[PDB]
Amino acid sequence: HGHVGADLAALCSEAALQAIRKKMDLIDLEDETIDAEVMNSLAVTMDDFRWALSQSNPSALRETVVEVPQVTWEDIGGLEDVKRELQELVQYPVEHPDKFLKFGMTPSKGVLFYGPPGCGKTLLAKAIANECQANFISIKGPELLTMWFGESEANVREIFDKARQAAPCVLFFDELDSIAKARVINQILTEMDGMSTKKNVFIIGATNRPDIIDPAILRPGRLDQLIYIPLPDEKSRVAILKANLRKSPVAKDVDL
Amino acid sequence: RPNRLIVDEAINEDNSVVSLSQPKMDELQLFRGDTVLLKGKKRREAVCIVLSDDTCSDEKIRMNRVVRNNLRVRLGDVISIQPCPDVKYGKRIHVLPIDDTVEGITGNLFEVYLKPYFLEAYRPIRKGDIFLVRGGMRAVEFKVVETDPSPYCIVAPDTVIHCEGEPIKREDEEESLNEVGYDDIGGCRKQLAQIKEMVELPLRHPALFKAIGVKPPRGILLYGPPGTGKTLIARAVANETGAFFFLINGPEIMSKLAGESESNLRKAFEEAEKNAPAIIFIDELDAIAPKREKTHGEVERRIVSQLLTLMDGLKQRAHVIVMAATNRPNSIDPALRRFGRFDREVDIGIPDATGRLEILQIHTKNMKLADDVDLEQVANETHGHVGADLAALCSEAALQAIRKKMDLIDLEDETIDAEVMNSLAVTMDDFRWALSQSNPSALRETVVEVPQVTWEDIGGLEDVKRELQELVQYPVEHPDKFLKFGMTPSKGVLFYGPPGCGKTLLAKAIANECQANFISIKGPELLTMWFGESEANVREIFDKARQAAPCVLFFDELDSIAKARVINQILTEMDGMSTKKNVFIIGATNRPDIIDPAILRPGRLDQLIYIPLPDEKSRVAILKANLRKSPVAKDVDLEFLAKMTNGFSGADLTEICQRACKLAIRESIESEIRRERERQTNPSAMEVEEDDPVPEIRRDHFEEAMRFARRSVSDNDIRKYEMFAQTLQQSRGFGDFRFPS
Amino acid sequence: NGPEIMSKLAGESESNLRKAFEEAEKNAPAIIFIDELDAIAPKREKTHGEVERRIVSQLLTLMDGLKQRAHVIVMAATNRPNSIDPALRRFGRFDREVDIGIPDATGRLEILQIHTKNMKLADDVDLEQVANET
């Protein structure tokens, strides 16, 4: 992750050089002129690639990445009301844009999750992005408040027009109350009203202290719906428990 | 392969002669009148005719002195011999008297030193050969520099003479001895091996790299602190192969007129393109290409763009690589750190303790030392010194040894006799003087090294040892079993306990055990970033940890900014750090409740290991450990001293083994007062032997130094850590359950 | 002199520096002296032009271009070591740095003993007393 094409060319050349360097038993000093044996009878193996990935090649990437996620709906079972609501708020304005035009109902532009910390909020937000075949960017808390700690408040316009460039996206804040420990909420607030509605970008924000939030974010037009994420129930628990044991071979008599 | 043989002494006087063994004749099949080349050190060779004799051993060649010196080989070293069928006659080899033993003869001397010496042998003479001819108490060696055939020549007597030039002095030897070898540079053996791996195999084998299709490098950055010989290393790599150096100086291509420096750069790159597989070198890049903020004019921008265009205008078939030399990679214009110009960046950093022994071993070569000196002892100190600082140390110690000998180096003898010139050896207190009285170290930044503390330095804590082994050793010693069932490794622990119970002395132990590097930043080094608002200055100390792959970076008192940010600056960096690198982040603290809870989120810093007060076995271990240097009396018990000190922290009983040393040094100073202040100090009944009243720390010194002991940690604050340990739920709840049958 | 090799035309001061270093190289074991170095080589912040940077680099190149057999040493004279361009405090150019600081009380007696040489003093004066003050 983070490699570019030139970095991958460098990876291929270094893996080939490591495969040469393990064959110094034939490429000797007594044979200065190298015979035609090892020139065409040397194939690279997998641990050479793993060495060349591990031992070297720092990635030249730190900024955001646009992609479609690969998580699925059954990765977190249950929450059928939340699934129905997110389908009603994401899928229907893009899969059927004409029926929303028959009787003129305008689509909403974003929900606000809230619940206990670590109940699969991001793992729920990526599921609808994967289901709609929609791109998904994500900025976090520490990426957010380092803007206003060094007073770079006017540096969300680029991360919004980058979302404008990828048309079917759902930009996801995470812990946007992180600056509510003591601005940039106003900088998103002046940008969200300037964003048009014919583009189908949605703004889902997550939080853990829903009372400390600014009430101006809850005005109708900006962020209206308030979906509550509860603790995981039984079927969701067995689903996530099976989901985390994809890689590990587990004994067949281990009950879940 | 039977080519390389050791060289030993010879008896015969004939010159350009190599001794072969008579049992091995049929493998080479060359007879007596055949010429051979001998591979020597520092890429200088010589040519000889063979002699087949029985006085040589089976694998040892008997050869004379001047061709042993032309190969620069001595007793024990192994040389190669190869046949060379390109024997031919030549015209006007340029002989030259290079010694001061000519005795003032000028003109044509070559009718008795050249013409009778060379005949009936087919004498092979290579360029630079240092053969001598002795005649009339005049042993003149003619080192030739211009041979019209290549590479060696057979001298004919009908060769016309050309000897209008003047014989010169030993200065031409001083420009040939700086064709240095690999052994002439020390302190950076790992980085020398890595750069040799990077450079040497494209250069000696240009065809295989094109054959597979890999790309040789186009630009290497040799960044490091200034003065560590970053130009000597490039000379050594280039001269250890068949390269061609070209030193472009830094401010020399700045001190030209406007519109003329680029002509010099174009001429230099053209000379690199025209010649062999070669290497140019640019020292002090940040004086011709600084950051963009340090560019108020525009001609420097023209020079920088000229450098960029000439750098990218090279071909992979030209076989030229570019090495630059800065001090820090953020002090360059970042427009030339893109792919194709300057990507691979090595760090010839500060030499360590045992990396400092060879760097003054190579400097104490021509200086006669006595037997009392100990290079290991001075190597143990002099932290922060660089190679130039150690050269200055050697010169100042030699000057102090001269300056103590002013009793013979007098004003009445203006011309100094040859006595003290070769009969003066430096002793150890001269080195101690030159270290103490002078030489401030030019180092303040961090240092990467493996620690030398051991696991038994702090006994006990077997659970903590098991946990640290499980969190450090197993992700690096067995990386495949972590890949069998996909468990990802953790990226850092958080110690917490009472102040001064061996936290850093525990953190260095696993770094030493894993043979892993260990950097360490502290509290006052941390919060001085955000007191002067240099918050974005931890990226360099993290990518420095990226450069040294098996490291464990150790914060210390990271709650020091929690007296009233940079925690967020580490927090945005820790998630961006990948996991295939095996760098771990161990942070220590003393107030675990005041810490930011965002550091405790799973993924960032999860495990919370509690360090208790030292127990009994740990106490006797640290007590024995602090008395390594001091000789202690054999009846001084320590187990009785162990179980008496019950609630003492690890930083309190390390104080009493200095208070006892101070209480014994007071009495050892005081005992010398009365012994020199003896009334009627007569030669009668004089103690010619040293009485040594306090040779070691006795028992009553500890019995009196214990009286000032005081426990630092109370009972009310160890309960704070017990209560914080109870704030972690501590495996409480349901308890034991069983799976159904 | 310091500002004397600044009061020349452009492109001519370096000719004077080269002539001076050549005269040092040609003559005996000798010593040149540069007074007021911080007027021809200040810190980098006090360099708004570029010709001063050409002079500074010329000084660096001619300084490093000497040989140990030439027997010439260079003494400069500043007031504080942080008031110099730190690119010439590296090893090989300017390392050893002495401090002829302020003279003390009894160090002040000889400095006016050497000044009261040609002046006839009476018997009532006491150089120790004035040395105690000032």
CB of B80 less than 8 A from some CB of A: no
- How far is the C-alpha of B698 from the C-alpha of B644, rounded, in Å? 19
Q: What is the DSSP letter of B697?
A: B
Query: HSE (CB half, 13 Å, CA atoms) of C27?
Result: 12
Gap between the Cα atoms of A242 and A235, Å rounded: 11
**Per-residue 3-state assignment (H helix, E strand, C coil) for chain A:** CCCCHHHHHHHHHHHHHHHHHCCCCCCCCCCCCCCCCCCCCCCCCHHHHHHHHHCCCCCCCCCCCCCCCCCCHHHCCCCHHHHHHHHHHHHHHHHCCCHHHHCCCCCCCCEEEECCCCCCCHHHHHHHHHHCCCECCECCHHHHHHHHHCCCCCCCHHHHHHHHHCCCEEEECCCCCCCCCCCCHHHHHHHHCCCCCCCCCEEEEEECCCCCCCHHHHCCCCCCEEEECCCCCHHHHHHHHHHCCCCCCCCCCCCC
Q: Does B287 touch chain C if contact means CB atoms closer than 8 Å?
A: yes
Q: How far apart are CA B291 and CA C72, in angstroms?
A: 36
Contact between A148 and A117 (Cβ < 8 Å):
no
DSSP B67: H
**Sign of CA pseudo-dihedral A146, A148, A150, A154:** positive
Best residue of A55, A149, A174, A255 to probe chain B, by most B CBs closer than 10 Å:
A149
Query: CB under 8 Å to B407, separation ≥6 — which residues?
Result: none
- Six token digits for residue B36: 């051979």
Quick one: CA torsion of B676, B677, B678, B683, rounded to 10 degrees? 40
H or E, element range at B399:
helix B387-403
Separation in Å, CA B342 to CA A115, B265, B322, B482: 49, 18, 9, 36
Other Cβ atoms less than 10 A from the Cβ of C36: the count is 16
Which residues, 6 or more positions from B201, have their beta carbon under 8 angstroms from its beta carbon? A17, A20, B209
Structural contact between residues C60 and C93, judged by C-beta atoms closer than 8 angstroms: yes
**Which helix (H) or strand (E) element contains residue B10?**
none
**E-state strands within B71-214:** 78-83, 124-126, 132-134, 139-141, 152-154
| Cβ pair A238, A232 in contact under 8 A | no
Task: Give the C-alpha separation, C92 to B197, whole Å.
Answer: 31
- DSSP, collapsed to helix, strand or coil, labels residue B346 as strand
Chains A, B: CB contacts within 8 A come to: 59
Nearest to B388 among C54, C57, C91 (CB): C91
Rounded to 10 deg, the angle between the C51-64 and C13-26 helix axes is 10
Q: Does B539 touch chain A (CB under 8 A)?
A: no
Q: How far apart are CA B145 and CA B98, in angstroms?
A: 11
CB atoms within 10 A of CB B306: 16
| Amino acid (one-letter) located at B130 | I
- As a whole number of angstroms, the distance between CA B441 and CA B443 comes to 6
**CA quadruple B346, B351, B355, B357: dihedral sign:** positive
Q: Are A168 and A67 in contact (CB under 8 A)?
A: no
The DSSP letter of residue B490 is: P
Q: Which residues contact B684 (CB under 8 A, 6 or more apart)?
A: none
Q: How far apart are CA B265 and CA B285, in angstroms?
A: 14
User: Please, which residues bridge with residue B346 across strands?
Assistant: B222
- Is the preceding peptide bond at B351 cis, omega within 30 degrees of 0? no
CA distances from B131 to B13, B289, B712 (A): 12, 49, 77
Determine, for residues B226 and C58 on separate chains, whether the beta-carbon distance falls below 8 Å: no
- Cα–Cα distances (Å) from B290 to A36, A164, B331, B534, in that order, read 48, 37, 6, 21
Residue B618: CB atoms within 10 A of its CB come to 19
Q: Do A247 and B739 touch (CB under 8 A)?
A: no
As to burial, measured by CB atoms within 10 angstroms (0-12 exposed, 13-18 middle, 19+ buried), residue B711 is: middle
Q: Is B62 helix (H, G, I), strand (E, B) or coil?
A: strand
Those residues with Cβ within 8 angstroms of residue C44's Cβ, 6 or more apart along the chain or in another chain: B294, C85
Region of B486 on the Ramachandran plot (φ > 0 left; ψ -120 to 50 alpha; else beta): left
Residue A239 to residue A80: CA distance in whole angstroms: 14
CA–CA distance, A40 with A44 (Å, rounded to integer): 12
Going by their DSSP bridges, the two strands B46-53 and A111-114 should be labelled as unpaired
Handedness of CA B603, A77, A243, B738 (dihedral sign): positive
What is the number of H-type helices and E-type strands within chain B? 24, 19
Type of residue numbered B105: I
Tokens of B206: 């240009």
Contact of B296 with chain C, judged by CB distance below 8 Å, is answered with yes
Method: cryo-EM
Q: In sequence order, which ranges of B183-331 are alpha helices (DSSP H)? A: 189-204, 206-212, 232-239, 261-274, 299-312
CA distance B650 to A6: 53
Q: Are C57 and C29 contacting, i.e. CB atoms less than 8 angstroms apart?
A: no
Phi, psi of B367 (to 5 degrees): -110, 130
Q: Distances from the Cα of B475 to the Cαs of A4, A46, B511, B584, in angstroms?
A: 27, 19, 14, 11
Please list the residues that pair with B610 across neighbouring strands. Answer: B496
Q: Which helix (H) or strand (E) is B708 found in, with range? A: none
Q: Say if A15 is an interface residue toward chain B (CB within 8 Å).
A: no
* Residue type present at position A94: V
All residues of chain C having their beta carbon less than 8 Å from the beta carbon of residue B255 are 14, 54, 57-58, 61
Q: Name the token pair of B701.
A: 């010194």
The residue assigned the tokens 């990437």 is: A61
Place of tokens 């464990």: B552
Decide if B594 touches A, using CB distance below 8 A. no
Q: Are A14 and A56 in contact (CB under 8 A)?
A: yes
Contact B492, B601 (CB under 8 A): no
Amino acid (1-letter code) at residue B415: T
Identify the three-state secondary structure at position B719. helix
Cα dihedral across residues C117, C121, C123, C126: positive or negative? negative
Residue of A140, A247, A252 to mutate when probing chain B, most B C-beta within 10 A:
A247
Residue C62 CB contacts under 8 Å (≥ 6 apart), including other chains: C17, C18, C21
Residues in B 381-410 with any Cβ partner in C closer than 8 A = 388-389, 392
C-alpha count within 13 angstroms, C-beta hemisphere, residue B730: 9
Q: Which residues of C touch B287 (CB under 8 A)?
A: 57, 87
- Distance CA(C122)–CA(C116), nearest Å, equals 11
Cβ–Cβ < 8 Å for B131, B141: yes
Q: Give the phi and the psi of residue B528 in degrees, each rounded to 5.
A: -75, -10
Note whether C touches A: 3 CB pairs or more under 8 A: no
Distances (CA, A) of C120 to A15, B272, B375, C134: 91, 75, 62, 22
A207 and A176 Cβ atoms separated by less than 8 Å: yes
* Long-range pairs for C65-69: beta carbons < 8 A, 24 or more residues apart: C66/C21, C66/C25
Strand runs (DSSP E) across C36-99, as ranges? 72-77
B611 close to B579: Cβ distance less than 8 angstroms: no
Cross-sheet strand order for the sheet of B219-223: B245-248, B278-283, B320-325, B219-223, B344-347
CA neighbor of C58 nearest in space, from B282, B255, B285, B260 = B255
CA B701 centroid distance within chain? 43
Q: Nearest 5°: phi and psi at B80?
A: -110, 155
- B299 close contact with C: CB closer than 8 A: yes
One-letter amino acid of B26:
D
Local structure of B418: helix, strand or coil: coil
Q: How far apart are CA B579 and CA B562, in angstroms?
A: 29
Q: How far apart are CA B592 and CA B594, in angstroms?
A: 6
Resolution in A: 4.2
How many C-beta atoms lie closer than 10 Å to residue B559's C-beta? 21
How many Cα atoms occupy the beta-carbon half-sphere of B281 within 13 Å?
19
Q: How far apart are CA B322 and CA B201, in angstroms?
A: 16
B486 and A10 within 8 Å at the Cβ level: the answer is no
d(Cα A3, Cα A9) in Å, to the nearest integer? 10
As beta bridge partners, residue B7 has B61
Contacts of B286 in chain C (CB under 8 A): none
List of long-range contacts for A65-68, beta carbons under 8 Å, 24+ apart: A65/A137, A66/A135, A66/A136, A66/A137, A66/A162, A66/A166, A66/A169, A67/A135, A67/A136, A68/A129, A68/A130, A68/A133, A68/A134, A68/A135, A68/A136
CA distances in angstroms from C75 to B240, B391, C34, C71, listed in the order given: 39, 22, 6, 13
Q: Tell me how far apart the alpha carbons of residues B239 and B555 are, in angstroms, rounded to a whole number.
A: 43
Whether the Cβ atoms of residue B179 and residue B72 lie closer than 8 Å to each other: no
Conformational region of residue B104, where left means phi above 0, alpha means psi within -120 to 50, and beta covers everything else: left
Q: Tokens 């911080």 label which residue?
A: C38
**Which residue among B227, B299, B300 places its CB closest to the CB of C91?**
B227
Phi, psi of B178 (to 5 degrees): -85, 25
Give the residue from B263, B289, B278 showing the smallest Cα distance to B314.
B278
C66 shares contact with chain B (CB less than 8 Å) = no
Q: How many helices (H) and strands (E) does chain C have?
A: 4, 2
Name the region of B178 (left: φ>0; alpha: ψ -120 to 50; beta: rest): alpha
CA distances (Å), B334 to each of B290, B321, B329, B343, B655, in order? 9, 19, 9, 11, 51
Residues of A in contact with B578 (CB under 8 A): 1-2, 59
- Measured between CA atoms, the residue of chain B closest to residue A37 is B208
Mutation to test the B interface, candidates C15, C17, C44, C50, most B Cβ within 10 Å: C50
Q: Are B77 and B6 in contact (CB under 8 A)?
A: yes
Cα-atom radius of gyration of chain C, to the nearest Å? 20
Regarding beta strands B344-347 and B219-223, do their DSSP bridges make them parallel or antiparallel, or are they unpaired? parallel
Q: How far is CA B299 from the centre of its chain?
A: 38
Query: In 10 A of CB A52, how many CB atoms?
Result: 21
Structure tokens that stand for B679 in this block: 């009334």
Neighbours of B233 (CB within 10 A): 24
Q: Distance between CA atoms of B187 and B350, rounded to whole angstroms? A: 8
Answer yes or no: do C11 and B257 touch at CB < 8 A: yes
Q: How far apart are CA B78 and CA B74, in angstroms?
A: 9
Please list the residues that pair with A172 across neighbouring strands.
Answer: A138, A204
C99 in contact with chain B, both atoms CB, cutoff 8 A: no
Nearest residue to A218 (alpha-carbon basis) of A107, A89, A111, A87: A111
Q: Is B121 exposed, middle or buried (0-12, 13-18, 19+ CB in 10 A)?
A: middle
Single-letter amino acid code for the residue at B322: V
- Name the one residue in this structure whose structure tokens are 């087949």: B52
CB neighbour burial string for B151-161, b if at least 16 within 10 angstroms, e if fewer: ebbbbeeebee
Q: Is C71 annotated as a binding residue?
A: no
Q: Do A247 and B486 touch (CB under 8 A)?
A: yes
**A106 phi and psi angles, rounded to 5 deg:** -80, 145
- Count CB atoms within 10 A of the CB of residue B703: 11
- Cβ contacts of A222 within 8 Å, gap of 6 or more: A109, A110, A189, A192, A193, A216
Contact by Cβ (8 Å): B493, B611 = no
CA distance B488 to B535: 31
Cite the DSSP H helix spans in B83-231: 115-118, 171-174, 189-204, 206-212
Six-digit token pair at C50? 């570029």
Query: How close is the nearest chain B Cα to the Cα of A147, in Å?
Result: 11
Contacts of B724 (CB under 8 A, 6+ apart): B496, B592, B593
